[PDB]
Design a protein around this ligand. Sequence first.
Ligand SMILES: CCCCCCCCCCCCCCCC(=O)SCCNC(=O)CCNC(=O)[C@@H](O)C(C)(C)COP(=O)(O)OP(=O)(O)OC[C@H]1O[C@@H](n2cnc3c(N)ncnc32)[C@H](O)[C@@H]1OP(=O)(O)O
Length: 86
Amino acid sequence: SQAEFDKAAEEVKHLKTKPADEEMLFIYSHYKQATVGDINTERPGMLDFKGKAKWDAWNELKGTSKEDAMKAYIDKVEELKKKYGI
Ligand SMILES: CCCCCCCCCCCCCCCC(=O)SCCNC(=O)CCNC(=O)[C@@H](O)C(C)(C)COP(=O)(O)OP(=O)(O)OC[C@H]1O[C@@H](n2cnc3c(N)ncnc32)[C@H](O)[C@@H]1OP(=O)(O)O
């Protein structure tokens, strides 16, 4: 793992706003892969925007490598910074 990623996790959660879905979706899938990996949970079903989008976005990366997902995750947090603050 690469702690800077977790640090990014704190930092992103500090964003004075909850970013737009796409940006959220990226952080979510990247964080979910970066930490969990092979999605093995269920499909929310009930909700779409917050249930399938964020599950789908992660299923779409089901077999990735932590560290990479971290770089992109963190780099996304950096991108967010510009738009939302951090
Ligand atoms: C529309 C579809 C995509 C977005 C769906 C919503 C969830 C997206 C998670 C990705 C990160 C979102 C960051 C938004 C928050 C900010 O950027 S700063 C926000 C100021 N806003 C508010 O106070 C209102 C919104 N706040 C929140 O959502 C936070 O209070 C939050 C709940 C994130 C605090 O986290 P915590 O209480 O510690 O844990 P959970 O409540 O379990 O976290 C919520 C979901 O996010 C996943 N998660 C946890 N930590 C991270 C990091 N670092 N990156 C990405 N995702 C993270 C949790 O797993 C949970 O999702 P899930 O398990 O999929 O249901």
